[PDB]
Each structure stands twice: as structure tokens, then as C-alpha cells.
Write an enzyme that holds these catalytic residues in place. Structure first.
Site, PDB file in Angstrom:
ATOM      1  CD  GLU A 140      -2.884  -1.281   2.251  1.00 52.79           C
ATOM      2  OE1 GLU A 140      -2.838  -0.534   3.245  1.00 52.79           O
ATOM      3  OE2 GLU A 140      -3.880  -1.988   1.974  1.00 52.79           O
ATOM      4  CD  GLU A 163      -3.572  -6.532   3.213  1.00 54.99           C
ATOM      5  OE1 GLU A 163      -2.328  -6.402   3.200  1.00 54.99           O
ATOM      6  OE2 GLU A 163      -4.335  -5.706   3.760  1.00 54.99           O
ATOM      7  CB  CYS A 179      -8.948  -7.780   5.660  1.00 58.58           C
ATOM      8  SG  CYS A 179      -8.543  -6.076   5.210  1.00 58.58           S
ATOM      9  CG  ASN A 201     -10.886 -10.393  -6.983  1.00 59.32           C
ATOM     10  OD1 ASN A 201      -9.986  -9.603  -7.240  1.00 59.32           O
ATOM     11  ND2 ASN A 201     -11.656 -10.271  -5.912  1.00 59.32           N
TER      12      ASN A 201
END
Ligand code: NAG
EC number: 3.2.1.45
Length: 497
Positions: free
Chosen positions: A235, A340, A342, A370
Site C-alpha cells: 500500500e 490482500e 480483509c 475477481n
């Protein structure tokens, strides 16, 4: 061959209880003959990847929704699925007795489990650490002579990674990502906050940082561990925000482009680790396609970028077509990989919700979106967390598929675990996404892929409360008559010859 031991904690569904001597698991894969399909089902009502079988007939008895496999229409091939071996995950796993530790690792990487084949490894500390540190905190050591791996790596992370590979059903790929560089290489001289590398691409600071990547790979190689890929930074946009709480290192898309072209790319290329793949971005997808345009339209940078790593916070909304779809259109030959994911960041929601079916649905839904948008892999965050969503030195805010209760030498498998498993267990590396046409508008989320051996796999997610009559057709085999119950997820598998 062991069923789930259900336990409710007051949420929409149950968790499966595992301890030192028991954990739900599967028998080795047993593939049925042509004309028969295998169905694995999980439901909010309690079913956990239960196996059943049925026929694929020549006659069609259903009159509702029809999903038709279109094997000739080929899309992306899958790299794999997995999770992150953060300091926190390692600490939680190692808090269980050895027998329990092995049941947890098997649940994730074994054929008796859900067959993970990817592990993301942070380069030094992040928020899911119990302290701050990098591999070279000794000030101004531009040749990184004092670079070294701490206990987090040599005692926690590395031993667990070896054990996972040992238990692994398939070859496992390692992916590394750094959160922050030593503070003496940053403009703000702090592990977090708004700050980037000092100087500009090409100078001693940028060259040392790139050297750090090589040092990291060398160190891990000494421990008999090789990496499949590394990301340019975790990030990078976070380090541009004033007051950012977690370890970070800011990079504007232009800065990343130049760092890769002038430093990281060349350095990795001239190293013995030249075969390691480099993934750019490793940030939220709403930063696409812009970040992609800035970096990849530069030949000197593009020649080092193998793919684009993306993150996504399931609690939030983001159009996949304008981000993932548009990016694939502009750069169709640069793979997209979800590094990643979450959930549970909702200020009003508890970090950990034991038994939340919704969070599970958010996972499988995200994986499907995705896959429908060219992504070749999906990687979860922390492999495990404690009941409070920690340890995290800044603050707990996300959930994890497996929650460890150390005081009881037990761990719970969340619905998230199974929703992930409906994909990871049945979609091995090399699988290719193929066409799956819906005969009419419906409320289901579905995706079809073809295994390397040519067999079919179709995942069907029903996020509605109503059962949906369904027929699945495979031109070469026939019709599969079934029903997608409300609040359920199914994975169908069948031979095509
Ligand atoms: C937890 O696992 C089994 C399954 O419920 C239970 O019977 C037992 O009390 C626990 N196992 C041990 C000995 O840790």
C-alpha cells in the site's frame, strides 16, 4: 473423515471447533466416473463442505435458471490461493500445543484441508506485529552489513512456513511485501506517518532500499526458502497520508515507476534472484487504472513488472469493471493478482465475529468478482488471529478465517475459511477460467474453471434467502439438476470424458 464440531457465539452461523486432538477434515480426493458429479456444500444453517454425488443426465427436467459450461471460451489461468504469515498469525499458531498446530496447518495446506498454495510474507514488521522493527535499524549502513533476520523470522515465521510446505498438497508459492524501510532512509525518519524514501530514484538511498530486497531474499534462501514474487511496497499510497498509523513507505505512482525502473528492477535483475517476479501497486483497486497507466506506459519500468497486485476491503464498495476490467483492457498482458483481502473494518462492527456467515459470503463473492475480472490469484490477510483480532500494535479492526483461543488450546474455523476453501481446495494452480452462460437474469454468483486435466469445477454462491432451482449443462456430458439453497455455497466437480 471428521465432521465439523459446530459452536455458536451468537452470530448468523457457527464456527467449527478444533483442538489438540480433533479437527474436521476431508478424505483423500476420490474422483467419480463420467456421468457423475461431486457436490460440496456449506450453508448458513450449519453444513460445512459436505460431499454428495449425483448424475449428469442426457435429459433436462429443470425449467428454471440454466448455467451452460462453454469450455471453448478460455480466460485467465490461476496462480493460486492462500494467506499471510504475519507475526500475529505465527504467534497465534505457535500458542497452541504442537498437535493442535499441525491440525491448523493441515486445515489450510493439506489435501485433508483446503489446499492453500500461496503464503504472503511481510518483510519485517507491520501493524500485525507486537513491536516495530526492520531488518536494518542500525543507522546509516548503506551497504547493509548489519542486515539480519530477527526472532519473528527465524523462530516464528520460517519454521511455520517449512512445516506448511511439508504438509502442502501442492507446490507452494511465497510472496514477499515490505511495509516500511529502515527509518534512516525515510524523509520523516519514522516507521509510519507521511514519509517516503529520501532523495530521488537512483541515489544511495534508493539503491540501498533495492539492495534490502536482495538481502531479504538472500537471508530467506539461507533458510532453504525461495520466493515466487515480491511486491514493490505494501500500500504505497498509505505513506502519502499525514498521520498514517501503521508502518508504511509512501510512493506516488510516478515515484514507484522510477524506483522500479532505476533501482528495484535492475538490482533484482543483476542478482541471483533474477527469477523472482515483481508485482506493482499492492494497494486498493480504486487506484486503477491510473497507477497502471503511469508505471506500465514506461518501457524502462514495464520490463521489470510481471503483474499488478491489488487489495480490497470487502466492507466497502468498488466497481470491478472500471478498475480491474479497464486495467486488463489497457494492459491485457500484465496479470492481476489479489494480494490482500480483509473484512470487519466497520467502525460499528466487532473486529472478530465468530460464526458470521455474511463475512464468509463477502469472501466468496469477492473471489468470484475477481475471477470474473481476470484476477489470477486471491490472497487472504492474517492466517490466524486471537478472539480480539490481534495481536496488532496499533489497533484490531479485521477478522481472520481461523481464530485461536490459546487459553483453551483450541481454534475456530470461521465461515470465511470454508467460503475460501470452496475455491482453494478445488482450483489448483494452472486451472483456467472458462465460459459459463446464464440462461436468464438471476441472483446467484457463479464461475466455472477447467482443471489442468480437463475436468470441470463450478462454484455457485447464493447470497439470497431463497432457494434457487438450477440446471448446469456441460455440452460434452449432459445436464446436472440441482438447487442452490438460500444462504449457501456449492462447488461442483465432474469429469468431462
Ligand atoms: C476437543 O475435540 C474433541 C471433539 O469435540 C472433544 O471430544 C475433546 O474434548 C477435545 N479434544 C481434546 C482432548 O483436546
Amino acid at each position: 473423515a471428521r465432521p465439523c464440531i459446530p459452536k455458536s457465539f451468537g452470530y448468523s452461523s457457527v464456527v467449527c471447533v478444533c483442538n489438540a486432538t480433533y479437527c474436521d477434515s476431508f478424505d483423500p480426493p476420490t474422483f467419480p466416473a463420467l456421468g457423475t458429479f461431486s457436490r460440496y456444500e456449506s450453508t448458513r444453517s450449519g453444513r460445512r463442505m459436505e460431499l454428495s454425488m449425483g448424475p449428469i443426465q442426457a435429459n433436462h427436467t429443470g425449467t428454471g435458471l440454466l448455467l451452460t459450461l462453454q469450455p471453448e471460451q478460455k480466460f485467465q489461468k490461476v496462480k493460486g490461493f492462500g494467506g499471510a504469515m504475519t507475526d500475529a498469525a505465527a504467534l497465534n499458531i505457535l500458542a497452541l500445543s504442537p498437535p493442535a498446530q499441525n491440525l491448523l496447518l493441515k486445515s489450510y495446506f493439506s489435501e485433508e484441508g483446503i489446499g492453500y498454495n500461496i503464503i504472503r510474507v511481510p518483510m519485517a514488521s507491520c501493524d500485525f506485529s507486537i513491536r516495530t522493527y526492520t531488518y536494518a535499524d542500525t543507522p546509516d549502513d548503506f551497504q547493509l552489513h548489519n542486515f539480519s533476520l530477527p526472532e519473528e523470522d527465524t523462530k516464528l515465521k520460517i519454521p511455520l512456513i517449512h512445516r506448511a510446505l511439508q504438509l502442502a498438497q501442492r507446490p507452494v508459492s511465497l510472496l514477499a511485501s515490505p511495509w516500511t524501510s529502515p527509518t534512516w532512509l525515510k524523509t520523516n525518519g519514522a516507521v509510519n506517518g507521511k514519509g517516503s524514501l529520501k532523495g530521488q530514484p537512483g541515489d544511495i538511498y534508493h539503491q540501498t532500499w533495492a539492495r534490502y530486497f536482495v538481502k531479504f531474499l538472500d537471508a530467506y534462501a539461507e533458510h532453504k526458502l525461495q520466493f515466487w514474487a515480491v511486491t514493490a511496497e505494501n500500500e504505497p499510497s498509505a505513506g502519502l497520508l499525514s498521520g498514517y498509523p501503521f508502518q508504511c513507505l509512501g510512493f506516488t505512482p510516478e515515484h514507484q515507476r522510477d524506483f522500479i525502473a532505476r533501482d528495484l528492477g535492475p538490482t533484482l535483475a543483476n542478482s541471483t534472484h533474477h527469477n523472482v517476479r515483481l508485482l506493482m501497486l499492492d494497494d486498493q483497486r480504486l487506484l486503477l487504472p491510473h497507477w497502471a497507466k503511469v508505471v506500465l506506459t514506461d518501457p524502462e519500468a514495464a520490463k521489470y513488472v510481471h503483474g499488478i497486485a491489488v487489495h480490497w476491503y470487502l466492507d466497502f464498495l468498488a466497481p470491478a469493471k472500471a478498475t480491474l476490467g479497464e486495467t486488463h483492457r489497457l494492459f491485457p498482458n500484465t496479470m492481476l493478482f489479489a494480494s490482500e483481502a480483509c473484512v470487519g473494518s466497520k467502525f460499528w462492527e466487532q473486529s472478530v465475529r465468530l460464526g458470521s456467515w455474511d463475512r464468509g459470503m463477502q469472501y466468496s463473492h469477492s473471489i468470484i468478482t475477481n475471477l470474473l475480472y481476470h484476477v489470477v490469484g486471491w490472497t487472504d490477510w492474517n492466517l490466524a488471529l486471537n478472539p480480539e483480532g490481534g495481536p496488532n500494535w496499533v489497533r484490531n479492526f479485521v477478522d481472520s478465517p481461523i481464530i485461536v483461543d490459546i487459553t483453551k488450546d483450541t481454534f475456530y474455523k470461521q465461515p470465511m475459511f470454508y467460503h475460501l476453501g470452496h475455491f482453494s481446495k478445488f482450483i489448483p494452480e494452472g486451472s483456467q477460467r472458462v465460459g459459463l452462460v446464464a440462461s436468464q437474469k438471476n441472483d446467484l454468483d457463479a464461475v466455472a474453471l477447467m482443471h489442468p486435466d480437463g475436468s470441470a469445477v463450478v462454484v455457485v454462491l447464493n447470497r439470497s434467502s431463497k432457494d434457487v432451482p438450477l440446471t448446469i449443462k456441460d455440452p460434452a456430458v449432459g445436464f446436472l439438476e440441482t438447487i442452490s439453497p438460500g444462504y449457501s455455497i456449492h462447488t461442483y466437480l465432474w469429469h468431462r470424458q
